[PDB]
Design a protein around this ligand. Structure first.
Ligand SMILES: Nc1ncnc2c1ncn2[C@@H]1O[C@H](COP(=O)(O)OP(=O)(O)OP(O)(O)=S)[C@@H](O)[C@H]1O
Ligand SMILES: Nc1ncnc2c1ncn2[C@@H]1O[C@H](COP(=O)(O)OP(=O)(O)OP(O)(O)=S)[C@@H](O)[C@H]1O
Lengths: 721, 161, 161
């Protein structure tokens, strides 16, 4: 109800009546409280609403002292009988004043006002008007000041607005050590955004709230300064100093250990300096004016480069991210806040896994926030879904994260079935033979899905064999099964090389040079798409400088960029290709991959491909030769897909191909030295060419047949009508 | 002094005295300043105390116009002599309100209130802005609008579109 | 000779003389032409120089309508007859205004000034157009946007060039 100051003045009125041996309390006794002390700082006595308003404080002093002498000496027992209606009314009026003034507590000024409004000198010896406006003016110009300049974190903390923080006790102590300096009063927190800089300032506030602060700072209070009053609050040229200088001086003395702080101190460098608030502050740094700032490391760098002065006042305080275990500790401290915020229970394992998840899948975010996001997001997820529950650790988190960050890998299937149990079948259905390539694909994904693959390495395989054997097709089909979308594959022509390639590859352009589109094909796409299948079109012909660079993705997945940042791959499957082995494939020694032969190939590949790459690669995969037996399946597969891809079914075929057509293809388009690719030449050269002509001649109205000639031919529906 | 929102209204009021070529600014010109243009955020006219107070602000504008046409002269050279003692009182009243509110500047909220204290319609069942107590009930919802800066996508959606 | 706007108005004015079957086209019909219909885009009527000046567009209209009633309605042979000497004067005066204003084609606005000068709705319930100061200021404030930022290629095409 009352401020401590208001209570003091009222209390003094009461106790002065006791000390002066006076019966019922009168307006006189509150006036006695007003003149209770010689201290000029006491507004009720010298730096008064009277003295700086309209009348000599002595006039009033003598009104009161005359009256105090005039009231007769009583037995101590009644010395302060009651406030009666007289002081009751003054206090009630002080409350009416609060309502008029919109003041949350009764001020000593409300007591000064209310008393003065009711009061009049009781005797002819002194006269003075109750100059209400003068006393209000003087009251308004005193004490109330920071609500116009900075947000009072400490009182708001007393009011429960503070978020307590843990695990930063040294960082908090560091700000204390700096704040405890006698000369260099200015600390600043420097680090990554999301590192916990504001959190540390609030940590200081927590230290203040629990009064765990050294005498120099023991009475401290924190206030959030800048942008509003320092920028929005400006229309005139001197507005960088009006209000700003004002508050700097308002807080230098008496009013406890006021410490302002800046959360976004980046501004305080000035756009071209020009003392845009920025210089006046350090200009006054020889004393008081204790302020703590906060900036990111790069913003720090920028304000340093753009100023050269605040840095002589401000102590650089480095803030490091916590370890995963430490992150969990803060998560635990924060856990109940989240359970409350969302009305859901959270498992300790939720917190544990959130933190390690973040380390694994959120490289662009710091652990404090990243882990918290996984928690607060999961909780929010449930809060929305709550119309139905609680948060369940990795269950909720893996799904939640995958939904936002990508990586469905962690969701686990409703049924593993086609999801890597029967996948070898499904892959063998799309492509024929080459089961080891198929197994490699499945295994790559299975290890990823199971959390077993070495996390530092993307699945990586190099595919050897004769072009036309399905090496690209495999990669595309992998994307097919990986995303249920074959166009999500990333494919780079790795053979387009000379040394002049930086940006075309993950290296990017370099900032400071023309062009700021970097590694678009790889770096930008990788940043955007957390995983894919990356196909390198004949690494056999790629320049070795690039291959050496690609190695970095191949293993130890970290990826740099000319932007000064990194990408850091993880879950992208990479596929490299070569036909070196064609020199051995053309031996035609069985459809199966032969021992020794395949080794001569891989040996030669190393000779013509840095083994350093191959010494990191998950494995080299070799394709089976497409024997006619393989063809006997492939032809149907391809004719089916080829037809299905032909726009819409306004015609298409009945396809009475039977063995006769199949064999023709196996006897005519079947080049032992070019895989199935020449069968496609046959198919288009014969089947589609005739078809196109029949369509062109409008000899087909709907459907179509394939009729073996002894070659192939088509039928006529309308007779060239 | 006055801030920009109050100054806009005050400027308009004086402008209106000149728009009507009148020698002095009268309460009617200020009421006319309150209702200038159909810009919703204008508490003096549309997102106002009047609608909240269950009054028709356009009807009130008709009242204002009925009063404006009764201005005794529109003579050019005689125009723009004084802000008038009548409004001296009103602006002084606004200053009194600032003291009552501990306010460092006069906002349109204050200038509205001050005129309202001295305003009238010579009508029993006044179609005037709702009386002062309601003026306070709604004026006190202010301080202690976005449509000026943004499109209400939700409302457009409510309206289909 | 005339702008597309002036032509619209004069087409309408002459049209009105035949719609109401009047003995001659009068200043009243041109005022009525300006009051084509209460279209939101109606520059000479809803957004006009009178409404933003001194008098209510709705009441102005009613006077004009009373005048259209007062001008006798006759049979098709005596109906319409002429543009009238009255408007031969108004439109020639509008042409004089064009020269004063450096504008090659007659603006409907110039017609409003020439027209208004002849007319005078001297009712005790005056609707007489607000005089020239309000009329002109509002006329000068008409639009004043896109043309400061653009070339009207379509008018240019109408004007050749
Ligand atoms: N040590 C900690 N104690 C308590 N809360 C923390 C801690 N570390 C992080 N947080 C949480 O992190 C969020 C605010 O993070 P901060 O690190 O202050 O953000 P910030 O990094 O200060 O913002 P920048 O980078 O200066 S814009 C809050 O939601 C806190 O719950
Ligand atoms: N093993 C297979 N199973 C099913 N269909 C196949 C198979 N092999 C090829 N098809 C055909 O294989 C051809 C694609 O050839 P690929 O071997 O992927 O090209 P490759 O790869 O050479 P690139 O592109 O430089 S690696 C297509 O035209 C398919 O019709």
């Amino acid at each position: 109800q009352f401020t401590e100051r208001a209570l003091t003045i009222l209390t003094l009125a009461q106790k002065l009546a006791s000390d002066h041996q006076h019966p019922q309390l009168q307006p006189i006794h509150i006036l006695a409280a007003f003149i209770e002390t010689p201290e000029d700082g006491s507004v009720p006595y010298l730096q008064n609403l009277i003295e700086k308003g309209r009348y000599d404080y002595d006039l009033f002093k003598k009104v009161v002292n005359r009256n105090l002498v005039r009231i007769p000496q009583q037995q101590p027992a009644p010395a302060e009988i009651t406030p009666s209606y007289a002081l009751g009314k003054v206090l009630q009026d002080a409350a009416k004043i609060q309502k008029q003034q919109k003041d949350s507590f009764i001020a000593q000024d409300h007591i000064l006002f209310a008393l003065f409004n009711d009061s009049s000198i009781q005797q002819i010896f002194k006269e003075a008007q109750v100059d209400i406006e003068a006393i209000k003016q003087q009251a308004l110009e005193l004490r109330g000041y920071l609500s116009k300049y900075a947000i009072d974190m400490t009182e708001q903390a007393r009011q429960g607005k503070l978020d307590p923080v843990i695990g930063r006790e040294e960082e908090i102590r560091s700000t204390i050590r700096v704040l405890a300096r006698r000369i260099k009063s200015n600390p600043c927190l420097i680090g990554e955004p999301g590192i916990g800089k504001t959190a540390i300032i609030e940590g200081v506030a927590q230290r203040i709230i629990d009064d765990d602060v050294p005498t120099i700072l023991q009475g401290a209070k924190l206030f959030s300064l800048d942008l509003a009053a320092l920028t929005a609050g400006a229309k005139y040229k001197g507005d960088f100093e009006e209000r700003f200088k004002g508050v700097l001086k308002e807080i230098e003395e008496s009013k406890t250990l006021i410490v302002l702080f800046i959360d976004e101190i980046h501004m305080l460098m000035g756009n071209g300096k020009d003392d845009a608030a920025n210089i006046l502050k350090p200009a006054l740094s020889r004393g008081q004016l204790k302020v703590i700032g906060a900036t990111t490391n790069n913003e720090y760098r920028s304000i340093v480069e753009k100023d050269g002065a605040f840095e002589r006042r401000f102590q650089k305080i480095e803030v490091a991210e916590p370890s995963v275990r430490q992150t969990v500790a803060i998560l635990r401290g924060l856990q109940p806040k989240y359970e409350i915020h969302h009305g859901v229970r959270i498992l300790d394992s939720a917190l544990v896994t959130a933190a390690q998840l973040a380390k694994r899948y959120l490289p662009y975010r710091r652990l404090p926030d990243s882990a918290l996001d996984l928690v607060d997001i999961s909780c929010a997820g449930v809060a929305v879904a709550r119309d139905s529950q609680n948060v369940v650790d990795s269950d909720t988190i893996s799904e939640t994260a995958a939904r936002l960050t990508g990586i469905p890998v962690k969701k686990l299937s409703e049924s593993e079935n086609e999801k890597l149990i029967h996948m070898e079948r499904d892959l063998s259905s799309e492509v024929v033979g080459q089961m080891d390539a198929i197994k490699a694909v499945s295994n790559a994904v299975r290890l990823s899905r199971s959390g077993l693959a070495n996390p530092r390495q993307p699945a990586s395989f190099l595919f050897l064999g004769l072009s036309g054997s399905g090496k690209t097709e495999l990669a595309k089909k992998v994307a097919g099964f990986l995303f249920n979308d074959e166009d999500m594959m990333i494919r780079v022509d790795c053979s387009e090389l000379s040394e002049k390639y930086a940006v075309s590859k993950l290296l990017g352009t370099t900032a400071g040079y023309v062009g700021y589109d970097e590694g678009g094909f790889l770096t930008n796409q990788l940043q955007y798409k957390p995983y894919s299948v990356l196909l390198f079109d004949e690494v056999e012909k790629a320049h070795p400088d690039v291959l050496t660079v690609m190695l970095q993705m191949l293993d130890d997945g970290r990826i740099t960029s000319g932007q000064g940042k990194t990408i850091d791959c993880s879950n992208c499957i990479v596929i490299m290709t070569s036909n070196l082995g064609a020199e051995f494939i053309n031996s035609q020694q069985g459809s199966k991959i032969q021992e020794s032969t395949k080794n001569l190939v891989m040996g030669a590949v190393r000779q013509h491909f840095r083994p350093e790459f191959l010494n990191r690669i998950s494995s080299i995969v070799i394709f089976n030769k497409l024997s006619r037996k393989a063809i006997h399946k492939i032809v149907d597969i391809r004719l089916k897909e080829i037809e299905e891809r032909f726009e819409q079914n306004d015609k298409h075929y009945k396809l009475n191909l039977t063995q006769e057509a199949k064999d023709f293809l196996a006897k005519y388009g079947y080049s032992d030295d070019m895989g199935a690719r020449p069968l496609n030449r046959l198919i288009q050269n014969e089947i589609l060419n005739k078809l196109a002509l029949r369509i062109l001649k409008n000899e087909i109205k709907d459907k179509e047949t394939v009729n073996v000639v002894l070659e192939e031919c088509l039928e006529v529906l309308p007779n060239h009508e």
